[PDB]
Design an enzyme around this catalytic site. Structure first.
Site, mmCIF file in Angstrom:
data_model
loop_
_atom_site.group_PDB
_atom_site.id
_atom_site.type_symbol
_atom_site.label_atom_id
_atom_site.label_comp_id
_atom_site.label_asym_id
_atom_site.label_seq_id
_atom_site.Cartn_x
_atom_site.Cartn_y
_atom_site.Cartn_z
ATOM 1 N N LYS A 156 -27.407 -69.827 3.903
ATOM 2 C CA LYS A 156 -26.163 -69.788 4.668
ATOM 3 C C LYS A 156 -26.171 -68.667 5.701
ATOM 4 C CE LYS A 156 -22.619 -70.434 2.249
ATOM 5 N NZ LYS A 156 -21.639 -70.201 1.153
ATOM 6 N N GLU A 182 -14.681 -59.594 1.142
ATOM 7 C CA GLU A 182 -16.118 -59.429 1.004
ATOM 8 C C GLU A 182 -16.460 -58.541 -0.187
ATOM 9 O OE1 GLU A 182 -18.841 -60.773 1.669
ATOM 10 O OE2 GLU A 182 -19.643 -60.161 3.614
ATOM 11 N N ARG A 183 -17.662 -58.741 -0.716
ATOM 12 C CA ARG A 183 -18.246 -57.799 -1.659
ATOM 13 C C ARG A 183 -18.956 -56.701 -0.881
ATOM 14 N NH1 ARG A 183 -18.792 -62.489 -5.697
ATOM 15 N NH2 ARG A 183 -19.837 -63.610 -4.000
HETATM 16 N N1 ADP Z 1 -36.269 -71.071 8.548
HETATM 17 C C1 ADP Z 1 -36.504 -70.690 7.264
HETATM 18 N N2 ADP Z 1 -37.759 -70.648 6.747
HETATM 19 C C2 ADP Z 1 -38.006 -70.273 5.478
HETATM 20 N N3 ADP Z 1 -37.038 -69.910 4.621
HETATM 21 C C3 ADP Z 1 -35.736 -69.906 4.997
HETATM 22 C C4 ADP Z 1 -35.386 -70.301 6.369
HETATM 23 N N4 ADP Z 1 -34.044 -70.200 6.457
HETATM 24 C C5 ADP Z 1 -33.582 -69.777 5.252
HETATM 25 N N5 ADP Z 1 -34.591 -69.595 4.384
HETATM 26 C C6 ADP Z 1 -34.461 -69.147 2.976
HETATM 27 O O1 ADP Z 1 -33.124 -68.753 2.652
HETATM 28 C C7 ADP Z 1 -33.184 -67.774 1.608
HETATM 29 C C8 ADP Z 1 -32.045 -66.759 1.665
HETATM 30 O O2 ADP Z 1 -30.839 -67.360 2.126
HETATM 31 P P1 ADP Z 1 -29.538 -66.426 2.293
HETATM 32 O O3 ADP Z 1 -28.356 -67.246 2.753
HETATM 33 O O4 ADP Z 1 -29.965 -65.222 3.096
HETATM 34 O O5 ADP Z 1 -29.240 -65.918 0.793
HETATM 35 P P2 ADP Z 1 -27.759 -65.883 0.158
HETATM 36 O O6 ADP Z 1 -27.257 -67.306 0.227
HETATM 37 O O7 ADP Z 1 -28.021 -65.389 -1.244
HETATM 38 O O8 ADP Z 1 -26.998 -64.907 1.026
HETATM 39 C C9 ADP Z 1 -34.535 -67.086 1.738
HETATM 40 O O9 ADP Z 1 -35.200 -67.063 0.475
HETATM 41 C C10 ADP Z 1 -35.324 -67.923 2.719
HETATM 42 O O10 ADP Z 1 -36.572 -68.319 2.150
#
Ligand code: ADP
Ligand code: ATP
Ligand code: ATP
Ligand code: MG
Lengths: 460, 510, 173, 169
Positions: A156, A182-183
């Site tokens: 996200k 927010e946290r």
């Molecule tokens: N273009 C991309 N290529 C590879 N992995 C991606 C890509 N976009 C998102 N991800 C994956 O999304 C994960 C983290 O999503 P994020 O939204 O930052 O975490 P959270 O939802 O816990 O905040 C990472 O492990 C990453 O591998």
């Protein structure tokens, strides 16, 4: 000169008595000396006899009865404009980072009326995001509201950063992030990640943490909305990120419960619909410019009939669903093409070609999801030669939806790509119409446009 | 029409001289006593949360400042109070003793020791109510807290400064898991605080006895608010423990604090609010019940080195600090959609769901995967454990679906048969005895054994004996490797080859 | 009704007047304060949601026959709680408490025709022993009772009217 | 498709000699503007009256809307000609009475609506009727004779999860 005096302090609710000829109006801001710090109070109700009832925008502890109260005659005013970019602020517009004073040029009141009937834009226009899946299956209209239903781990925040970057760079707009409830740890992580991705300068961050009293969590969205409205008046197109509209609803419920109003069905505040409309109606497309919103949505019990989802959905123009199942395939962005919907997807809005391409893609993917059951239960032999063709085409489509993001270069190690609407439309139209059928399926994965897919196939 | 503190003698006093303000604002008189809440006339200078001194060296907290009287809650026995008693407003907010001397001591929420082992040596006092560090002060959590349970440490990593909600129905082992996590930190640098809200005194005495039996009491501070104590004491008790924990966090040390039955604190606060006639919300909880738990839990955080340096006036420079909170929430009938459970779910960073069905089944730890999750994830985990745990995660994910095929698994693809007999053995391995925490070396060893297919030929009925024999063998013949793993938690080919040798050599025996 | 809220003010005022041996002046002041409350413009003023202190200071302006040190204090105390409308009832309860303190009781006598002085004397003498207080009779003879007499003191009633006998006899039906 | 089925009807009456009214209660201002633009595109706008109560306007306003529209239609109905009125989201009206009602501390009934909620719609809807020529003559004071007035109404109600058994539906 302070003119009022405190008469009651019951939790966050503070009552102040003013001279009868000077009673502040509703939504005005007061301030008091809570020891060694100024505490701001927001007027909620005018009671009889000059007594006013206010919600404290801070810690209420240490307030004595009889303290002097200064009546600021304007509502809560926050700094706006270019100076806010890259800065973290609370609901009051005070800097939360240690980066010193904000070089404000204007301060705007947060409570303002919605654009009039005569000011609204006279057209419906798409906001090209540059992401194949979103621009194809769930097109954004300018001034539209977009809901994110994905969980955690589904990428996200990377999608949010990619949208921020694409709007700031490919277009000439700015973005605002409203951290409603927010946290603190997650806010710090988001700030550091945006600093690393070098998108921090392009976006303005206002944070209301969960540890704040309900008034701050309830009003923090309005500050971000006000800054976005400032950006719009300059003539740009703006993205407004709301981190949880559900927490805005809950904060309004808590405030109304503190005020002691009668509850409504399922215990929500009686003003739920109007409180939602006040925020949502300011996000529209004006002749000068437009504000576009992406809002994370939470369903209290997976119950889509609950009053909060029922009220929220009435304003959403499109829905984007993130699923961990697609991320398991390594496809990013992990957007579900079958559940994501947009009510702009209509021949009278996006044109006949886009409509037909999207409907074709959706029907092919649904047919593939049907045939996967047959393949699992009975095996590939059962599949006719026509169904094998649709299976191969569906796999190629499902892998073409992948795209490398400029902010994800540290992950894939591949340069990001920007795809215009016509390019992705033409590519999917081609794949469906049977050209490019001869290419290997891996030539579509993370490639970009079709003109890059044919190049990748030449060496794959 | 009803009277509002309009009583004959006060009115007569006002008749004699209207400007009664000539009397000091520092004092007042009780005019009503009921259910532990008193109404005080006077106290013109009282402030929210101020401590009001009562006869008999008792205290009351001023919570409702009304236009004519102050509503205060007695922090102790109240039945002997009577109207007309004088009260004096001490100009102090509620404060509790803090310091290292508290370690090993049992105290009430006021900081008075109740163990009978004499007074408390303490490094001053801290306000019970405090503000959590801001966004800029925080630092990302990347350091492990070992619970000593294979399931928890493998699939649900807990990081230093994380909030991990233990949630489940009654008699499912929440308290056991919390106290075992307390035990495991006996030899680490983390200091534990155990806060008992609304527990019966016998249970707390037994818990303290078990803590001292395994030697962890010397590292633990116990804050007790038994079920018979005033509701104000129970409601304020978690905040006092947090304030005690904040002492170490700001100085650049690590602390682990466990709040037992936050739902009981919520019940106590609801009682206090309703006795003070504050408007009720859903399920009769006051409007700001979410704020109550939110401001408490947000204190648990990891602070960067610069915050520690600024706070200690530069006496500690290179150390970060952290406070880890493990709140406990009891779901009545497996309902996570209730009010307080929903709020606590929304606040915390992760969930450990304990299931009564699994507890009734053979798996004593009863941790339910697929529903439990830690949003911090692999950052909290050591390198070797992070490397190994993915196999367990995927094995259980696959095993969950095949459980439907278990009834008639005789007619299946041999690949599916292998997956099923691997998931079953992993689930059988994850069970663990109470009060027996396993070091990171031992958890990593048994996880390596399970993942690399060495259990493929071992019978489901014998998994536990295999584990015990392997642990005894490695403790006997290969202690240095276990020492290195416990010291570093690193992983590389030089370690995997050694583990392969360990397992091949053991498999010749037993 | 303001009966319940008037009681504390009446009791306080009576105790204060007793401690200062000025009951009659207080009764006159209370009567005056009760009369201004009935003024048509003052009634609208009291109905409006003015601040307690401004309403009090406006009320004191219309009264120059009040003992300021004590009467103004009384009015300001009632004003701070909005009880100013209770004054006509505070007056009545003050009178009642004074009559209780002086051990004096009013009695109403109703008969078909005017009584002789000797009958009145016997009635008063009997009532004084019944109540153990001094009595003050008043005669309110009535057109409807054709014989007998009714004696009412407090709320205890003794009926010897022939009308009462006629109805009590029909009750045996 | 609830709004579409209705506006289509208004467009069809473009040449049928029936006046039209469109009452938007609690709708988004952009959607109202778009519907007005579509009505003008097909040329029905010259025959319609559009009453607007946007989602952000005060709850009080969102009640005289569906009654003002009834009065505007009643003008034609009493004059002796035909009108058609299409209230939009009569549900969004009912939520608004609840707010004005709960703000007035009135005891709620089933769900959270006050018992008067039936009277609210019953008195609004009952005005849509066909009146005999004698009523038209009596109202017009003899100016119009032998013509029967009428007022058709198409209320719109929104159901959660297709539940036709809810209170307001
Ligand atoms: N273009 C991309 N290529 C590879 N992995 C991606 C890509 N976009 C998102 N991800 C994956 O999304 C994960 C983290 O999503 P994020 O939204 O930052 O975490 P959270 O939802 O816990 O905040 C990472 O492990 C990453 O591998
Ligand atoms: N791993 C384990 N192995 C064996 N027994 C266990 C284990 N974990 C817990 N138990 C047992 O389960 C029982 C319940 O444990 P515990 O008291 O910690 O539960 P709880 O969820 O906190 O209960 P409550 O809601 O009643 O306080 C105890 O008898 C305890 O010994
Ligand atoms: N006859 C039709 N053929 C094809 N599409 C139609 C038809 N009628 C309506 N639609 C489509 O239905 C969708 C929703 O239409 P509309 O907004 O009127 O529904 P609604 O129920 O009124 O929506 P809302 O509940 O948000 O007011 C639009 O895509 C519209 O074009
Ligand atoms: Mg327990």
């Amino acid at each position: 000169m302070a003119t009022g005096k405190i008469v009651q302090v019951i939790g966050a609710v503070v009552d102040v008595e003013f001279p009868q000829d000077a009673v502040p109006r509703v939504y005005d801001a007061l301030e008091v000396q809570n020891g060694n710090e100024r505490l701001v109070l927001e007027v909620q109700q005018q009671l009889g006899g000059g007594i006013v009832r206010t919600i404290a925008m801070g810690s209420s502890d240490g307030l004595r009865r009889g303290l002097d109260v200064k009546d600021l005659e304007h509502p809560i005013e926050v700094p706006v404009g270019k100076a806010t970019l890259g800065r973290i602020m609370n609901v009051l517009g005070e800097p939360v980072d240690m980066k010193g004073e904000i070089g404000e040029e204007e301060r705007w009141a947060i409570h303002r009326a919605a654009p009039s009937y005569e000011e609204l834009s006279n057209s419906q226009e798409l906001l090209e995001t540059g992401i194949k899946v979103i621009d194809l299956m769930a097109p954004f209209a300018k001034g539209g509201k977009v809901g994110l239903f994905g969980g955690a781990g589904v990428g996200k925040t990377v999608n949010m950063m990619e949208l921020i970057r694409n709007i700031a760079i490919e277009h000439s707009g700015y973005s605002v992030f409203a951290g409603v409830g927010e946290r603190t740890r997650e806010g710090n992580d988001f700030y550091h990640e945006m600093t690393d991705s070098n998108v921090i300068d392009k976006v303005s961050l206002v944070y209301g943490q969960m540890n704040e009293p309900p008034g701050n969590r309830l009003r923090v969205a309005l500050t971000g909305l006000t800054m976005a409205e400032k950006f719009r008046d300059e003539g740009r197109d703006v993205l407004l990120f709301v981190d949880n509209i559900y927490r805005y609803t809950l904060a309004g419920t808590e405030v109304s419960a503190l005020l002691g109003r009668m509850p409504s069905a399922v215990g929500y505040q009686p003003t739920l619909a109007e409180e939602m409309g006040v925020l949502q109606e300011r996000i529209t497309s004006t002749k000068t410019g437009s504000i576009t919103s992406v809002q994370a949505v939470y369903v209290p019990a997976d119950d889509l009939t609950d009053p909060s989802p029922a009220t929220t959905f009435a304003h959403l123009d499109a829905t984007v669903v993130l699923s961990r199942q697609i991320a398991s395939l390594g496809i990013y962005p992990a957007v579900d093409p079958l559940d994501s919907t947009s009510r702009q997807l209509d021949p009278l809005v996006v044109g006949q070609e886009h409509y037909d391409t999207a409907r074709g893609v959706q029907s092919i993917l649904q047919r593939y999801q049907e045939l996967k059951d047959i393949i699992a239960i009975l095996g590939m032999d059962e599949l006719s030669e026509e169904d094998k063709l649709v299976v191969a085409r569906a796999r190629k489509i499902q892998r073409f939806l992948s795209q490398p993001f400029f902010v994800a270069e540290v992950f894939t190690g591949s340069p990001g790509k920007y795809v215009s609407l016509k390019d992705t439309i033409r590519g999917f139209k081609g794949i469906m119409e049977g050209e490019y059928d001869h290419l290997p399926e891996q030539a579509f994965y993370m490639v970009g446009s079709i003109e890059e897919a044919v190049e990748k196939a030449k060496k794959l | 029409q009803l009277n509002s503190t309009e009583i004959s003698e006060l009115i007569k006093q006002r008749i004699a001289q209207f400007n009664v303000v000539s009397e000091a604002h520092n004092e007042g008189t009780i005019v009503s006593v009921s259910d532990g809440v008193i109404r005080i006339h006077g106290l013109a200078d009282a402030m929210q949360g101020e401590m009001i001194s009562l006869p008999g060296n008792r205290y009351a907290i001023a919570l409702n400042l009304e236009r004519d009287s102050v509503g205060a809650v007695v922090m102790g026995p109240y039945a002997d109070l009577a109207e007309g008693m004088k009260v004096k407003a001490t100009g102090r907010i509620l404060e509790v003793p803090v310091g290292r001397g508290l370690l090993g001591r049992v105290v009430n929420t006021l900081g008075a020791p109740i163990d009978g082992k004499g007074p408390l040596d303490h490094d001053g006092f801290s306000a019970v109510e405090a503000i959590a560090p801001g966004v800029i002060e925080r630092q990302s959590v990347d350091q492990p807290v070992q619970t000593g349970y294979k399931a928890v440490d493998s699939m649900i990593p807990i990081g230093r400064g994380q909030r991990e909600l233990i949630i489940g129905d009654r008699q499912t082992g929440k308290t056991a898991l919390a106290i075992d996590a307390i035990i495991n930190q006996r030899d680490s640098g983390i200091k534990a605080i155990y806060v008992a809200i609304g527990q019966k005194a016998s249970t707390i005495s037994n818990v303290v006895r078990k803590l001292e039996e395994h030697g962890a009491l010397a590292n633990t501070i116990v804050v007790v608010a038994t079920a018979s104590e005033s509701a104000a004491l129970q409601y304020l008790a978690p905040y006092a423990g947090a304030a005690m924990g904040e002492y170490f966090r700001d100085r650049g040390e690590d602390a682990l604090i466990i709040y037992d039955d936050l739902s009981k604190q919520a019940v106590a606060y609801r009682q206090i609010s309703l006795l003070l006639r504050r408007p009720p919300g859903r399920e009769a909880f006051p409007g700001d019940v979410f704020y109550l738990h939110s401001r408490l839990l947000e204190r648990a955080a990891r602070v960067n080195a610069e915050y520690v340096e600024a706070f200690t006036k530069g006496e500690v420079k290179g150390k970060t600090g952290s406070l880890t909170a493990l709140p406990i929430i009891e779901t009545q009938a497996g309902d996570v959609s209730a009010f307080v459970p929903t709020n606590v779910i929304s606040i915390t960073d992760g969930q450990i769901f304990l299931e009564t069905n699994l507890f009734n089944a053979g798996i004593r730890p009863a941790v339910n995967p697929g529903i439990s999750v830690s949003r911090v994830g692999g950052a909290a985990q050591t390198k070797i454990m992070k490397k190994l745990s993915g196999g367990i995660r995927t094995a259980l994910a696959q095993y969950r679906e095949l459980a439907a095929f278990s009834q008639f698994a005789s007619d299946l693809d041999d690949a599916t048969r292998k997956q099923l007999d691997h998931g079953q053995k992993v689930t059988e391995l994850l069970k663990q005895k109470q009060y027996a925490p396993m070091s990171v070396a031992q958890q990593s060893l048994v996880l390596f054994a399970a993942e690399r297919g060495y259990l493929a030929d071992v019978e489901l009925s014998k998994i536990g004996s295999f584990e015990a024999a392997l642990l005894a063998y490695v403790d006997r013949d290969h202690a240095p490797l276990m020492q290195e793993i416990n010291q570093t938690g690193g992983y590389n080919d030089e370690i995997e080859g050694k583990l392969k040798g360990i397992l091949d050599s053991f498999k010749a025996t037993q | 009704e303001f009966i319940t809220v008037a009681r504390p003010y009446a009791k306080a005022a009576f105790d204060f007047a007793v401690e200062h041996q000025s009951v009659e002046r207080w009764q006159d002041m209370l009567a005056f304060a009760a009369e201004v409350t009935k003024n048509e413009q003052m009634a609208e003023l009291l109905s409006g949601a003015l601040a307690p202190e401004t309403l009090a200071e406006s009320f004191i302006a219309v009264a120059g026959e009040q003992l300021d040190e004590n009467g103004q204090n009384l009015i300001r105390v009632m004003a701070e709680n909005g009880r100013l409308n209770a004054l006509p009832d505070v007056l009545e309860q003050f009178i009642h408490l004074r009559a209780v303190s002086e051990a004096t009781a009013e009695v109403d006598v109703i008969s078909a025709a005017a009584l002789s002085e000797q009958q009145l004397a016997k009635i008063s003498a009997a009532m004084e022993k019944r109540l153990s207080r001094k009595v003050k009779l008043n005669a309110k003879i009535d057109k409807s009772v054709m014989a007998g007499v009714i004696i009412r003191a407090g709320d205890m009633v003794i009926d010897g009217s022939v009308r009462g006998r006629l109805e009590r006899l029909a009750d045996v039906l | 498709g609830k709004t579409a089925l209705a506006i289509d009807a208004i467009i069809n009456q473009r040449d049928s000699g029936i006046k039209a009214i469109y009452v938007a209660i609690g709708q988004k201002a952009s959607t109202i503007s778009n519907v007005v633009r579509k009505l003008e595109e097909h040329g029905a706008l010259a025959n319609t009256i559009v009453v607007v109560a946007t989602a952000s306007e005060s709850a009080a306003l969102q009640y005289l809307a569906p009654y003002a529209g009834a009065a505007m239609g009643e003008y034609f109905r009493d004059r002796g000609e035909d009108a058609l009125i299409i209230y939009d989201d009569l549900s969004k009206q009912a939520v608004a009475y609840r707010q004005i009602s709960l703000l007035l501390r009135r005891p709620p009934g089933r769900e959270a609506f006050p018992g008067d909620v039936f009277y609210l719609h019953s008195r609004l809807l009952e005005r849509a009727a066909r009146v005999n020529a004698e009523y038209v003559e009596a109202f017009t004071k003899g100016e119009v004779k032998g013509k029967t007035g009428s007022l058709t109404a198409l209320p719109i109600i929104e159901t959660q999860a297709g539940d036709v058994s809810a209170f307001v539906p």
